């Protein structure tokens, strides 16, 4: 399943993932494509933040879905 991810810079990345893939695996995929650490990557959709322990399908995320990626800073 291919999906799009828009970052705070209006940049949209198209990656290939599955519905059973967890948000943690999706963050690692964005890192290999750009180079950002998965620990600082945040996936937010429909106004709700996705949990690394949850899978894309759990958030009704289907192909062509556009997720929002944010850069988490060091805050405790």
């Amino acid at each position: 399943m291919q999906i799009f991810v828009k970052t705070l810079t209006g940049k949209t990345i198209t990656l290939e993932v599955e519905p059973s893939d967890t948000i943690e695996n999706v963050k690692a995929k964005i890192q290999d494509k750009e180079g950002i650490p998965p620990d600082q990557q945040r996936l937010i959709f429909a106004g709700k933040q996705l949990e690394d322990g949850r899978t894309l399908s759990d958030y009704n995320i289907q192909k062509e879905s556009t997720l929002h990626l944010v850069l988490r800073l060091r805050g405790g």
Partner: protein, 112 residues
């Protein structure tokens, strides 16, 4: 299990004033849903108004009868010639009104 209670700490302990990255990310996702809820809300307004609105009957008791009875007295009147001696003021009116209601473009246009 613990005394951390992580429930209303993200929607109050930090709020959007703690990070515009979280307030902007939720403002872009909520906006995309509204544009879809409306475009989808009205999309059904036309799918239900056309199926459960115009797709219904009304009051057509003699629909073809008006088409046959009217063309029955007008067709039998005219055949191999414009028989007007038999057409009354209404029978002739049906013939004069039939050729006048075919397309009244103007009626007054010869010299200028």
């Amino acid at each position: 299990h613990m005394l951390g209670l992580g429930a209303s700490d993200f929607e109050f302990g930090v709020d959007p004033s703690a990070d515009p990255e979280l307030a902007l990310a939720l403002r872009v996702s909520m906006e995309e849903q509204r544009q879809r809820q409306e475009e989808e809300a009205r999309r059904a307004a036309a799918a239900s108004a056309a199926e459960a609105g115009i797709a219904t009957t009304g009051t057509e008791d003699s629909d073809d009868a008006l088409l046959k009875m009217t063309i029955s007295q007008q067709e039998f009147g005219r055949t191999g010639l414009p028989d007007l001696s038999s057409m009354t003021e209404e029978e002739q009116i049906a013939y004069a009104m039939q050729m006048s209601l075919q397309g009244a473009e103007f009626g007054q246009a010869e010299s200028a």
